[PDB]
From a paper:
In our work, we provide the first crystal structure of DYRK1B in complex with AZ191, which will facilitate the future development of selective inhibitors. The kinase crystallized in the C222_1_ space group, featuring a single molecule per asymmetric unit. The structure is seen in the active DFG-in conformation. A clearly defined electron density indicates Tyr273 phosphorylation. AZ191 exemplifies an ATP mimetic kinase inhibitor and, accordingly, is located at the putative ATP binding site of DYRK1B ([Fig fig4]). The pyrimidine ring contributes a canonical interaction with the backbone amine of Leu193 within the hinge region. However, what is characteristic of AZ191, however, is that the methylpiperazine contributes to affinity by forming a hydrogen bond with the sidechain carboxyl of Asp199. In the DYRK1B structure, the manganese ion coordinates the side chains of Asp239 and Asp259, reorienting them away from the ATP binding pocket.
DYRKs belong to a larger family of CMGC kinases, which includes cyclin-dependent kinases (C), mitogen-activated protein kinases (M), glycogen synthase kinases (G), and CDC-like kinases (C). DYRK1B and DYRK1A kinases share a sequence identity of 85% among the catalytic domain residues.
Numbering used by the authors: 88 to 381, 395 to 434
The structure:
């Protein structure tokens, strides 16, 4: 607790109506997370609402947000069209021992959109609109000069610009890194965590595409595709849909043995611990066709499933690229 401004988690104690810097009036809490808090604030100088991300008062979180700041400014440097899929940082300042990042205020997040459907999912047409924008934001991050791995793609970090419009932007580069410059082994939110991160292998921009494949299914069905309770359970649920990962991946995977075991002359198989639910039927027995259930032709559903399976390829080299996804027949008349 610093002068009484911080709670026990080193989060700033948000008080509605408080005035900061004789400029910002705090209205309400938007969200909490590992990083800290996001608040809705009124900028009295410009007479506009903003969102303010208040980083936790910890050396570690302060240090990690230096990176997030640098990456946000990098993504704003040039006059590109693609950069407008990113919520852009208006400014940053220090306030009572907290680094504060000011963003344009958006309306709500993709989890809110799903809850408004009673978690039944959105139409295939809206899933398509959202997916093509998300693929484009990934194409942008893959630009060589950026080479940014978002590392925390998930519904909470995908915001709708306007309540009656399907435009989206992405937020939360607080765990992002650039290619090769990976600096954490336990990354991504668990439901959206890729096999290579689960397996401890070197990861690259493809981990975001894995997340995106998970998200598109959730958008359509209303529910997370792989809602694991821990990493072993996360692997188990992935394997139940997509089968055993390829031997070339498991052979070079430091944590292969956390989930899998070797059969003499039988390759790799899932370790059968008590973490496995009793009704578990085997690898690939929860077909994606049945998860999806029974612009909306049955051919459109088959194209959607095809795109999702290319996003959920185990081998990152084999997983569809942002450009490949954009050229996929799910989106394109040709
Ligand atoms: C009223 O505005 C919002 C309301 C909500 N909520 C979410 C809960 N439901 C129940 C209500 C609606 C969610 C987002 C917004 N707006 C908004 N606009 C800009 C940035 C951010 C932002 C969110 N996150 C996780 C971030 C992480 N890093 C940086 C920036 C952000 N959020
Ligand atoms: Mn700056
Ligand atoms: Mn995050
Ligand atoms: Mn459903």
């Amino acid at each position: 607790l610093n002068h009484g401004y911080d709670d026990d988690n080193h989060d700033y104690i948000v008080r509605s109506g408080e005035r900061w810097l004789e400029r910002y009036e705090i209205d309400s809490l938007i969200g909490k997370g590992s990083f800290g808090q996001v608040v809705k604030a009124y900028d009295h100088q410009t007479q506009e609402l903003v969102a303010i991300k208040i980083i936790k008062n910890k050396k570690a979180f302060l240090n990690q947000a230096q990176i997030e700041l640098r990456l946000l400014e990098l993504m704003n440097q040039h006059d590109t069209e693609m950069k407008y899929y990113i919520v852009h940082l208006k400014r940053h300042f220090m306030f009572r021992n907290h680094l504060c990042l000011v963003f344009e205020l958006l309306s709500y997040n993709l989890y809110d959109l799903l809850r408004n459907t009673h978690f039944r999912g959105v139409s295939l047409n809206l899933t398509r609109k959202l997916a093509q924008q998300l693929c484009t934001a990934l194409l942008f991050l893959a630009t060589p000069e950026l080479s940014i791995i978002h590392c925390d793609l998930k519904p909470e970090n995908i915001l709708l610009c306007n309540p009656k419009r399907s435009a989206i932007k992405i937020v939360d580069f607080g765990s992002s890194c650039q290619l090769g410059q990976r600096i954490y082994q336990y990354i991504q939110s668990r439901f959206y965590r890729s096999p290579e991160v689960l397996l401890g292998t070197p990861y690259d921009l493809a981990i975001d595409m894995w997340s995106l494949g998970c998200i598109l299914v959730e958008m359509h069905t209303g529910e997370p595709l792989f809602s694991g309770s821990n990493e072993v359970d996360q692997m188990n649920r992935i394997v139940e849909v997509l089968g055993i990962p390829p031997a070339a991946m498991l052979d070079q995977a430091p944590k292969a043995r956390k989930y899998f075991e070797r059969l003499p002359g039988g390759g790799w198989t899932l370790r059968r611990t008590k973490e496995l639910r009793k009704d578990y039927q085997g690898p690939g027995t929860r077909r994606l066709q049945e998860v999806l259930g029974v612009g909306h032709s049955p051919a459109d559903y088959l194209r959607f499933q095809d795109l999702v399976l290319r996003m959920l390829e185990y081998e990152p080299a084999a997983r569809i690229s942002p450009l490949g996804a954009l050229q996929h027949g799910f989106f394109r008349r040709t």
